[PDB]
């Protein structure tokens, strides 16, 4: 494969002592989880329990993600990552890092955020609203990027919105990474709808771009009302539902500029694609989310070539945030 890198933030990492990208030499000092009490359940994921409860020295509400250890480079990873980026603007804040006593299982502490509904939001949510917080992860992602991270998995599950304080919240940075020019990387990140080209070609030295790519698909889903937008059952089916929509020409021209030799898997099912307009996919019920603006700036992130996607501080220039 042909090499590349990023068109912002290249060497952002290099500048940097191994102090602030080294991970696996980051002394953690787990405090005692006995300043915390457990209120309740919030929810299960893959390899974490969360909870809310209440810091016990000043009477607040925090959330803790109890975690399965199971990769301790990877629990060091998103310490580091969450250490760096303490602070920015719409991360979720680590607050602590704590180990229970008996069991001496991880858990982190963050800030709590008092989440609205996904399906509570995308029915009243306006045109106006869409701006808002799009520009709000624009920042988190400009930040995280300007910091040499890439999240590698941006996706609403992923962006916690508390609708009635206007406040926005990046969260869950266990697949995050820190950039270094020409790094081959793990394609296997995100989740399987927000996923790039670039990780389904099996294309290893991808970028923030990727990010981008992620923010397009949402962006995709809320002003078309159609989520997931690119709906496939496997890793190869979302290749071909993208080729669905930005046609199999440009797909071909994107492997050509790169090198990259497509997986045998993809001969039966990639078939032939025209590449589509953006006003098809506008109906009754979607009208009133949608305008020319929108619509220049998601052609503008979904896009194969990774470095042909508008950059985080670039799509923060688009005349779709006019209004905000
Ligand atoms: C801990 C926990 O409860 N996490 C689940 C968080 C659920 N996220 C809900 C959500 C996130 C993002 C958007 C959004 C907003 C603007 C543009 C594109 C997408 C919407 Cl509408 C809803």
């Known amino acids: 494969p042909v090499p590349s890198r990023a068109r912002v933030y290249t060497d952002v990492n290099t500048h940097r002592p191994s102090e602030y990208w080294d991970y696996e030499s980051h002394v953690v000092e787990w405090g005692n989880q006995d300043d915390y009490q457990l209120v309740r359940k919030l929810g299960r994921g893959k390899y974490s329990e969360v909870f809310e409860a209440i810091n016990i020295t000043n009477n607040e509400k925090v959330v803790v ?6 990769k301790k480079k990877k629990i060091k ?9 303490r602070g920015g603007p719409n ?7 704590v180990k ?3 069991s001496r299982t991880p858990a982190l502490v963050f800030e709590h955020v008092n989440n609205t509904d996904f399906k509570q939001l995308y029915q009243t949510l306006t045109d106006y609203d869409i701006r808002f917080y799009m520009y709000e992860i624009l920042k988190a992602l400009d930040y995280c990027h300007s910091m040499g991270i890439m999240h590698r998995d941006v996706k609403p599950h992923n962006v916690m919105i508390d609708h009635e304080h206007r406040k926005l919240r990046l969260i869950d940075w266990g697949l995050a990474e ?4 020409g790094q081959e990387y793990n394609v296997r990140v995100a989740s399987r709808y927000f996923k790039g080209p670039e990780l389904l070609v099996d294309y290893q030295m991808y970028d923030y771009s990727l990010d981008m790519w992620s923010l397009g698909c949402m962006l995709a889903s809320m002003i078309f009302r159609k989520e997931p937008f690119f709906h496939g059952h496997d890793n190869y089916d979302q290749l071909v539902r993208i080729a669905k929509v930005l046609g199999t020409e440009d797909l071909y021209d994107y ?13 039966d099912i990639l078939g032939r694609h025209s590449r589509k307009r953006w006003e098809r996919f506008v109906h009754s019920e979607n009208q009133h989310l949608v305008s020319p603006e929108a ?3 998601l052609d503008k992130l979904l896009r194969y070539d990774h470095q042909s996607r508008l950059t985080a501080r670039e799509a923060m220039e688009h005349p779709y945030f006019y209004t905000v």
């Not at 993600?65 to 199971?70: C, D, S, Y």
């Open 91 to 97: 991360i979720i804040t680590l607050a602590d890092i």
């Open 255 to 267: 492997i050509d500029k790169y090198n990259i030799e497509l997986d045998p898997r993809f001969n």
């Open 100 to 102: 229970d006593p008996v």
């Open 178 to 181: 820190f950039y270094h020019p």
């Open 77 to 85: 990873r998103e310490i580091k990552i969450l250490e760096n980026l």
């Open 295 to 297: 619509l220049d700036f």
């Open 65 to 70: 993600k109890i975690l399965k250890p199971v």
